[PDB]
Amino acid sequence: PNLFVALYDFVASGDNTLSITKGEKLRVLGYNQTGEWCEAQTKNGQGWVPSNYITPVN
C-alpha cells in the first residue's frame, strides 16, 4: 500500500533528508507542499527523499 522502491541512489543533502540506494524498499509517510519531496522510512532511518526517485512495489 504505502510500499515503494528506490529508482536511483540518493545521497542525503539536508539533515532532514535520507540516503537511499537503488532497488531498495521504503514506506512513504507523505509529501511536502509541492509534491517534490517525500518523507520516507527505510531500514536505515527516516527522512525526505525526492519523489521522483521512488515508486510503489507490490
Layout: helices, strands, pairs:
Blueprint: E1 3-6, E2 25-31, E3 37-42, E4 45-50, E5 54-56
Antiparallel strand pairs: 1-2, 1-5, 2-3, 3-4
Modified residues (Phosphotyrosine): 8, 53
Protein name: Tyrosine-protein kinase ABL1
Organism: Homo sapiens
Explain what the structure shows.
This protein has a 5-stranded antiparallel β-sheet, with no helix packed on it. Helix content is 0%, strand content 45%. The termini are close together. It is mainly beta. It has strands at 3-6, 25-31, 37-42, 45-50, 54-56. The protein has a single domain (1-58), classed as SH3 Domains (SH3 type barrels, Roll), CATH 2.30.30. It is globular and about 30 Å long. It is classed as transferase. The entry lists the keywords beta shandwich, poly proline rich motifs. It forms a monomeric assembly.
In short:
It is classed as transferase. The chain is 0% helix and 45% strand.
Keyword list:
monomer, 58 residues, mainly beta, SH3 type barrels, five-stranded antiparallel beta sheet, 5 strands, transferase, beta shandwich, SH3 domain
What's the tally of helices? 0
Tell me what the CATH architecture is: Roll
**Total domain units:** 1
What level of helicity do the residues show? under 10%
The CATH C-level name is Mainly Beta
